[PDB]
Amino acid sequence: NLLYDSNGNIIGFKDFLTNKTYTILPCYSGRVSAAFYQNSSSPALLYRNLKCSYVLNNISFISQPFYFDSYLGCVLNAVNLTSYSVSSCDLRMGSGFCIDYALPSSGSASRGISSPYRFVTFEPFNVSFVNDSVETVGGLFEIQIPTNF
Amino acid sequence: TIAGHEEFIQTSSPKVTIDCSAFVCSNYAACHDLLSEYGTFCDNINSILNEVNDLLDITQLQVANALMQGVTLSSNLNTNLHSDVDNIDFKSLLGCLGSQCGSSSRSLLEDLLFNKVKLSDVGFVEAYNNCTGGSEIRDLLCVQSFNGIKVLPPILSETQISGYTTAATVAAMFPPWSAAAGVPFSLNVQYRINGLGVTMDVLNKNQKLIANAFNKALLSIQNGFTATNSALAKIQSVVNANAQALNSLLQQLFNKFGAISSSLQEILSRLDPPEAQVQIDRLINGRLTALNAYVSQQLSDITLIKAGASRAIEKVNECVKSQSPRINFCGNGNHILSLVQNAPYGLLFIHFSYKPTSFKTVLVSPGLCLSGDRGIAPKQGYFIKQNDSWMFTGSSYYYPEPISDKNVVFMNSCSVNFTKAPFIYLN
Amino acid sequence: LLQQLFNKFGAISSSLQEILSRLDPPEAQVQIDRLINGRLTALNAYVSQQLSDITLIKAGASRAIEKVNECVKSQSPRINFCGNGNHILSLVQNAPYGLLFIHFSYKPTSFKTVLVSPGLCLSGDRGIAPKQGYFIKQNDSWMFTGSSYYYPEPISDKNVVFMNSCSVNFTKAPFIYLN
Amino acid sequence: PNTGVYDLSGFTVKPVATVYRRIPNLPDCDIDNWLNNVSVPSPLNWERRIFSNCNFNLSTLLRLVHVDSFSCNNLDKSKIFGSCFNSITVDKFAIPNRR
Amino acid sequence: VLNRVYLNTTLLFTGYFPKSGANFRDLALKGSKYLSTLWYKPPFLSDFNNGIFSKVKNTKLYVNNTLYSEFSTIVIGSVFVNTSYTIVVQPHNGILEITACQYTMCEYPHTVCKSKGSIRNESWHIDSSEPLCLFKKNFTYNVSADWLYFHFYQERGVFYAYYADVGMPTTFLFSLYLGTILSHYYVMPLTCKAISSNTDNETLEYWVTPLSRRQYLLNFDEHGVITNAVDCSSSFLSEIQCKTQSFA
Ligand SMILES: *[C@@H]1O[C@H](CO)[C@@H](O[C@@H]2O[C@H](CO)[C@@H](O)[C@H](O)[C@H]2NC(C)=O)[C@H](O)[C@H]1NC(C)=O
Ligand SMILES: *[C@@H]1O[C@H](CO)[C@@H](O[C@@H]2O[C@H](CO)[C@@H](O)[C@H](O)[C@H]2NC(C)=O)[C@H](O)[C@H]1NC(C)=O
Ligand SMILES: *[C@@H]1O[C@H](CO)[C@@H](O[C@@H]2O[C@H](CO)[C@@H](O)[C@H](O)[C@H]2NC(C)=O)[C@H](O)[C@H]1NC(C)=O
Ligand SMILES: *[C@@H]1O[C@H](CO)[C@@H](O[C@@H]2O[C@H](CO)[C@@H](O)[C@H](O)[C@H]2NC(C)=O)[C@H](O)[C@H]1NC(C)=O
Ligand SMILES: *[C@@H]1O[C@H](CO)[C@@H](O)[C@H](O)[C@H]1NC(C)=O
Ligand SMILES: *[C@@H]1O[C@H](CO)[C@@H](O)[C@H](O)[C@H]1NC(C)=O
Ligand SMILES: *[C@@H]1O[C@H](CO)[C@@H](O)[C@H](O)[C@H]1NC(C)=O
Ligand SMILES: *[C@@H]1O[C@H](CO)[C@@H](O)[C@H](O)[C@H]1NC(C)=O
Ligand SMILES: *[C@@H]1O[C@H](CO)[C@@H](O)[C@H](O)[C@H]1NC(C)=O
Ligand SMILES: *[C@@H]1O[C@H](CO)[C@@H](O)[C@H](O)[C@H]1NC(C)=O
Ligand SMILES: *[C@@H]1O[C@H](CO)[C@@H](O)[C@H](O)[C@H]1NC(C)=O
Ligand SMILES: *[C@@H]1O[C@H](CO)[C@@H](O)[C@H](O)[C@H]1NC(C)=O
Ligand SMILES: *[C@@H]1O[C@H](CO)[C@@H](O)[C@H](O)[C@H]1NC(C)=O
Ligand SMILES: *[C@@H]1O[C@H](CO)[C@@H](O)[C@H](O)[C@H]1NC(C)=O
Ligand SMILES: *[C@@H]1O[C@H](CO)[C@@H](O)[C@H](O)[C@H]1NC(C)=O
Ligand SMILES: *[C@@H]1O[C@H](CO)[C@@H](O)[C@H](O)[C@H]1NC(C)=O
Ligand SMILES: *[C@@H]1O[C@H](CO)[C@@H](O)[C@H](O)[C@H]1NC(C)=O
């Protein structure tokens, strides 16, 4: 009536009174990554490798107006803005993603609520680009030579 | 002919993070209240591992800076149209480049590399996504992550590093030529083969042979990752060493260390609070000892990984992005050039080499004493006799040619064992 | 490391005065033994961390010795070793626990679009290639310019490398017989 | 505090329901009827009874016998009061007064 | 193991096992009419130290094209008198009668195949007084089985019996508290009539080997069946197999 593993823990059982067989899993255990910018009221929260249905039902019952799902997991109190990019970042989440902080300043504020944490893309390096052609312009190549230094 | 061989250098490792109180005293308030008397034991372990993972992020940024620094590309560059120069095919080496692609691809060399390694930086994310539910019944990584042991992603994606190596590879092929010394790729190949002692007449006459030798060398690279490639073995030893150490750390949660049980549930359902503490204290001491030893081993292995990353940055700067006058640094002598590719936890380098196939036995002289008591010595070559006349030959390809001022170095006197030659006032 | 003298390590206190004047000599040994094992474990962990920091500091010191010998005291024919390319020289200064290097680079400030050839085919089917520069075509006449500055100058023997054949994509120019 | 990323053990999960399974209308073990018996063995021929697949409780037993002393070992008395066991083996004999 | 299931795993388990590379002994005797006194001697009367593993050949006789299962009966005890308890395991063509009583055992006991009876009657005891029995039970096995396996061991006053008829690993049959230590066993000679070489060419087999407490590595497939086993201290390859916890 018991199913063990080789380390010696019970992972399943067959019921005596109903003959219904079950597998047991541990309850979910983890920590939360908090991206905190200075002088603000609350962090932005990342639950790694969790869908937001699981988070909003089975973990966190306090209300969260800003939430979305992402490649890293469930992101609370942040805005999905991954089309935007940034070259420097001090809140780096992993796999080429970042958290930016932008206040709704008094020139362009909104009276409705907003999340000042954005979930953006991190790209630290680049190439310089030139407009010239990669093929021969009639036998010759087009290059850019400095005239002053 | 032209030979070609591959080389893996490790520049990173999986970034382990450990929840120390959920490893030691998982869920039980008796254990947590006993553990609070060891002071700052879990804070020290968390700070050491955060320091290790910060060093890992710094070396990944140094590698990407070395790959990207100084390269200038044309804005009209589109690797769907341009993947070929001077009869040499680069299509299996390039990812995707251009303003109309979507920068989320690797080359097929990197596809073949990342499809024999399960636990790369994307295999950990997709294995951890399947722990709420098991997705079959159970898996060792989820048993580790429910006990406070988890691998975190690197700060840059592997498709980002694939874009960096694609930019580095295409800066050698197109007309700024910012990594082929400012000249086109086949011309650069010719000047490096000339720099070992092969004359230019041979290299202009055998240009298509050189291009097909390069194509064959690349294709023989491409069908080689087959269960005895030492680069694939060296890559998989990284992943196997990480999985072995994490499983050995998880096996410490089932030792007794001289207590009555390894389980905290079995001790707190059999004994009173004054006597359960004596048993819990032994488990706490054993598990803190095991965490201490794991952190010491991680601290020793980060130094080896930093040494490897410095060696790879030096190889990128002096074998791929330029060509150094250091003999025997990359390759083995008769080295021509290198290319670079993204690999799991490091880089793959492709070194191309000049290689002789047939030989001839020649009699040679190292110096000629001419009349006027002058001497000449040959300049990367030897002097030979052909039809009783002295001639020059280069040292790496047998081809007689007339003695000239571009062949020799002159001296106002001559050595004692220089061969006497009064017949020379030649070209 | 100083804050480990205030941990109890599962004993009753962290003060040896609070154990020697409160318990029995057969009984104080049990508590003093726990304090000893805790403090010795903490000392071993500190000594392991220092023995690992000294290897990273030695790797940095070997690299600084290299930059003193090959960028400051002389100049190697390497590229991208000191600085970041286009590098002229370096100077060195003392700093707390180390050295400060000052690197100097050539920096272009304005640019020009030119059309270049990578080598020329001359009469007699000879070839010339440019020696750190390009062949440009000014006033329907082939001249040489250097790579990192724009200055058209004549073609000579201190300007080109010679070869007794030409490549298949060298530009045909039979009207050239300069110095 | 400063800008940065932190790993927090926040409030994550609670156990909500319980599950409780037993097998019903099992007999009584009748430990006291064997303990409080007229025929009492000697220490030289001590006796044993095995009890399994039945119910018991320690309140009725420890008030239906004339309890002089009761002390457990590698156990605790409050840890019996809801537990199940695979079997219970009870052995008995009458004491020589000096020994 | 008791009520546990293990699935696709190796297991390091220490139990009451035979030593790998040791020696069985076929102890089944047989006689048509006569019985020698050498059959009841310490060559055949062995020791019960911790227990025995036994491998039994179920012979399948035919009377009127009717299949009769048969093998020998085993008797465990210390002095085999009526002031001491003896255990007797005896088959009855699909019924295994196991008793543990205070018997009055004969000097030269034997059993008799009841299909084709012998010259002598079956007489391993004579007990007119119906003696004290701590245990008496009947179990049923497979009549169409070719091999039956038994573990009989003792520990801390208790006697444990395991058996199998389908497959090689055994399952738990019973236990019995004794308070004493069993020291000897015996396999009885089966005085039959027609089983011999001159008749239909059948044989009696009862292979016995001792048991001890030792560690094995066991292999469990997707049905929870023990497919493979290795004694960890039998050779050097077995040391490597138990040190790697691996069969390859
Ligand atoms: C679960 O399965 C077992 C199968 O044995 C059922 O137990 C049997 O119930 C019948 C009731 O008439 C008894 O005669 C048998 O002796 C029982 N078998 C055993 C091994 O005890 C049991 O009833 C099933 N439960 C349900 C809810 O169907
Ligand atoms: C006390 O023990 C005696 C035996 O020592 C019990 O007597 C047994 O009673 C049962 C049921 O009546 C009989 O089946 C046994 O044969 C009796 N044994 C003997 C040796 O005669 C007696 O029942 C026990 N007392 C109580 C209250 O149960
Ligand atoms: C402990 O067990 C005893 C059994 O000996 C329980 O007593 C029984 O209680 C039921 C309920 O009325 C009666 O029908 C039985 O006749 C009782 N048996 C005896 C021998 O008196 C007792 O209830 C249990 N204690 C608790 C707290 O549940
Ligand atoms: C076990 O089975 C055997 C055989 O089926 C039973 O022995 C029979 O017992 C009856 C009544 O005592 C006799 O009439 C038969 O002659 C016996 N047959 C043999 C072959 O001896 C025995 O009674 C059973 N025992 C139990 C406890 O069930
Ligand atoms: C930022 O900090 C200053 C002082 O530290 C404080 O006056 C100000 O209100 C803070 N900003 C917000 C949005 O709270
Ligand atoms: C999550 O919560 C919902 C609603 O409370 C419930 O129906 C569901 O079964 C829960 N799932 C888990 C895995 O706890
Ligand atoms: C997040 O935003 C990107 C574009 O910014 C969009 O393509 C993606 O579907 C969004 N994902 C979610 C879960 O909202
Ligand atoms: C390229 O990188 C530089 C680095 O500072 C950055 O300023 C610039 O915005 C980047 N351009 C694009 C198009 O990403
Ligand atoms: C640069 O390219 C654009 C194409 O987007 C073209 O319109 C423009 O004329 C080009 N400029 C120069 C200076 O070539
Ligand atoms: C070069 O630049 C400097 C400052 O930008 C300027 O003063 C000078 O005139 C320039 N020289 C030429 C030749 O354009
Ligand atoms: C030479 O130029 C032609 C035309 O541009 C091109 O097709 C060919 O590939 C080139 N070959 C080499 C070796 O440069
Ligand atoms: C994760 O689960 C999906 C199904 O939800 C499955 O297709 C995929 O193979 C699993 N990945 C791993 C690494 O087990
Ligand atoms: C049985 O165990 C092996 C060993 O890991 C495994 O490869 C196989 O998938 C398992 N069988 C099933 C049905 O999971
Ligand atoms: C077998 O059949 C014969 C008659 O052909 C009969 O005499 C004999 O008793 C039978 N055997 C049994 C065991 O009934
Ligand atoms: C076997 O038992 C029967 C029944 O009492 C008896 O008649 C016969 O003589 C016995 N056999 C011997 C050899 O005594
Ligand atoms: C066990 O008995 C059943 C039916 O009696 C039969 O189908 C099966 O083959 C038997 N197994 C063995 C090993 O004799
Ligand atoms: C029994 O074995 C003997 C031994 O040689 C043989 O001669 C005889 O034919 C066999 N009989 C049968 C029925 O198999």
Author numbering:
A (entry chain C): 646 to 794
B (entry chain A): 795 to 1221
C (entry chain C): 1043 to 1221
D (entry chain C): 299 to 397
E (entry chain A): 51 to 298
Q: What is written in the article reporting this PDB entry?
A:
The spike (S) protein of HKU1 plays a crucial role in cell invasion by binding to host receptors, with the transmembrane serine protease TMPRSS2 recently identified as its protein receptor. The S protein of HKU1-B forms a trimeric structure, with each protomer featuring a furin cleavage site “RRKRR”, akin to SARS-CoV-2. S1 comprises four domains: N-terminal lectin-like domain (NTD), RBD, subdomain 1 (SD1), and subdomain 2 (SD2). S2 includes the fusion peptide (FP), the heptad repeat regions 1 (HR1), the central helix (CH), the connector domain (CD), the heptad repeat regions 2 (HR2), the transmembrane domain (TM), and the C-tail domain (CT).
To unravel the mechanism underlying the interaction between the S protein of HKU1-B and the host cell receptor TMPRSS2, we elucidated the cryo-EM structures of the HKU1-B S protein incubated with TMPRSS2 in various conformations, including a closed conformation, two 1up conformations (designated as 1up-1 and 1up-2), two 2up conformations (with or without TMPRSS2 bound, referred to as 2up-TMR and 2up-1), and a 3up conformation with TMPRSS2 bound (referred to as 3up-TMR). In the 2up-TMR conformation, two RBDs adopt the “up” position, each bound with a TMPRSS2 molecule, while the remaining RBD of protomer 3 remains in the “down” position. In 2up-TMR conformation, the RBD of protomer 3 disengages from the interface with the “up” position RBD of protomer 1, potentially contributing to the subsequent generation of the 3up conformation. Compared to the 2up-TMR conformation, the 3up-TMR rotates clockwise by 8°, with its RBDs leaning more towards the central axis. Additionally, in the 3up-TMR conformation, the CH bundle shifts outward by 2 Å compared to the 2up-TMR conformation, indicating the efficacy of the receptor binding on the modulation of the S protein conformation and subsequent membrane fusion. Binding of the receptor TMPRSS2 results in more open conformations of the S protein, changing the interaction network in the S protein and triggering a trend towards the post-fusion state, thus facilitating the initiation of the invasion into host cells. The binding of TMPRSS2 induces a clockwise rotation of the S1 subunit and a centripetal compression of the NTD, resulting in the rise of RBDs and reducing the contact area between S1 and S2.
